Design a protein around this ligand. Structure first.
Ligand SMILES: Cc1cccc(C)c1OCC(=O)N[C@@H](Cc1ccccc1)[C@@H](O)C[C@H](Cc1ccccc1)NC(=O)[C@H](C(C)C)N1CCCNC1=O
Lengths: 99, 99
């Protein structure tokens, strides 16, 4: 798909049997999802945004189905105001900016 | 041009005679630049990101040359960790996501 940017670029994603929408975000290095049950071990991490820092749980080798495409990578889970698909996964769906 | 996302998508921008780099950011509604001297009236505003909220100065009808091409729009100025070109200006340079 080609997507213009007049609206927020949301896509549907499926992770660990659960469905949600997330923003395709070229300004994000990492992928961050709202508090959810992901099974297994994790690592404490903190991410910095525009207003300061946020504590998250880092989960590795997570399967993400993004617009149906299957990719695997690191997902951060915590009290984010928006689910964000960052470049770590965008590269895996062949995402480019064109202008 | 087409830009892949293995690295952060920085572009050179020129605003009020000053040069800087900024992130092309599909996850940003608005454009925010580090503290700089923009002449003229402004409006107090707060933007909410990850980590919380940040106070900014809102400047309207500002000319921005993004990768050499001219657009006009609102720019927020404040203590941002990164200069960010948001969708308000991305739409004006015909920016699309392709995946
Ligand atoms: C930079 C980074 C590094 C590692 C991991 C991650 C997830 C990273 O990205 C986190 C991040 O906040 N990135 C921002 C841009 C970023 C890059 C580098 C440093 C800091 C930040 C931006 O892209 C996404 C973030 C999402 C969002 C948050 C709250 C509400 C709605 C949306 N968007 C916003 O903050 C925008 C701002 C910029 C105009 N925003 C503000 C309110 C209204 N909606 C909205 O669009």
């Amino acid at each position: 798909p080609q997507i213009t940017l007049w609206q927020r670029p949301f896509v549907t994603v499926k992770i660990a049997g659960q469905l949600m929408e997330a923003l395709l975000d070229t300004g994000a290095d990492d992928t961050i999802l709202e508090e959810m049950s992901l099974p297994g071990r994790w690592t404490p991490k903190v991410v910095g945004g525009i207003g300061g820092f946020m504590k998250v749980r880092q989960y590795d080798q997570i399967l993400v189905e993004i617009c149906g495409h299957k990719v695997i990578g690191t997902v951060l889970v915590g009290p984010t105001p928006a689910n964000i698909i960052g470049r770590n996964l965008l590269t895996q769906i062949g995402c480019t900016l064109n202008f």
